């Protein structure tokens, strides 16, 4: 049996969690689908992709510790081997 | 090939709350995993913090602890042999 852990420390911080969710399209393409999430600040008009470690294979996504007091818009597009499709309608959230 | 259509019905929910981060040092003791235990500041009712994945690293975090409540935490190490004795507890107020 192992020994006990030591120097256990617990700290507390206020953070933000944003959860996105959507339905897949009716026109799914010739094969399986993959999702790419894009982000844009309320001020700018600059849509930037949220790059990921893993392919977003489920129609849901989450973001941790977005800047507090800032407002964002999000939109999702689908990707095949054929190409990247047109974006969804955007939805706004304030952190 | 045929490019897919656009997703629909995008919806977003957001929560700002207190985020609790734990960290500890491994004991002087093959593959090991950790079991986290929780109890309110009245340190009587120790409950195991169940996880979706085994805790293989000396760190853990929780994002939805009850605000305004005080908790105590303690960690145990686990081998293929068994589960060892717990660490000293540490308190946090969220």
């Amino acid at each position: 049996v192992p020994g006990p852990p030591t120097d256990l420390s617990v700290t507390e911080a206020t953070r933000s969690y944003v959860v996105l969710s959507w339905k897949p399209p009716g026109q799914r393409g010739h094969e399986g689908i993959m999702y790419f999430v894009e982000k844009c600040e309320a001020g700018t008009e600059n849509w930037q992709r949220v790059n990921t470690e893993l392919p977003v294979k489920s129609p849901r996504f989450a973001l941790f510790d977005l800047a507090e007091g800032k407002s964002y818009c999000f939109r999702v597009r689908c990707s095949n081997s054929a190409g990247v499709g047109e974006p969804s309608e955007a939805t706004e959230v304030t952190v």
Side-chain angles (χ1 to χ4, degrees), chain A residues 19-90:
Chain A
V19 175
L20 299 176
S21 67
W22 59 90
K23 303 172 183 175
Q27 210 292 137
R28 292 220 195 194
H30 62 283
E31 56 185 30
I33 299 195
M34 198 179 295
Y35 299 105
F36 290 124
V37 179
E38 289 177 348
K39 177 192 58 169
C40 157
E41 175 169 8
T44 77
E45 252 294 301
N46 183 19
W47 286 103
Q48 286 298 324
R49 179 188 288 181
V50 174
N51 302 124
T52 52
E53 196 177 38
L54 275 265
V56 181
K57 55 177 200 304
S58 300
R60 279 170 299 258
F61 193 64
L63 296 168
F64 162 77
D65 193 59
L66 290 183
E68 290 75 31
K70 284 189 195 166
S71 170
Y72 295 85
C73 288
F74 293 99
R75 67 180 192 188
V76 189
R77 31 182 78 196
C78 300
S79 188
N80 269 345
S81 66
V84 184
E86 76 183 52
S88 70
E89 289 168 51

Side-chain angles (χ1 to χ4, degrees), chain A residues 6-34:
Chain A
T6 57
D7 310 320
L8 181 265
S9 164
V10 195
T11 47
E12 182 271 336
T14 299
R15 309 278 184 184
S16 191
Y17 250 115
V18 168
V19 175
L20 299 176
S21 67
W22 59 90
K23 303 172 183 175
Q27 210 292 137
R28 292 220 195 194
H30 62 283
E31 56 185 30
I33 299 195
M34 198 179 295

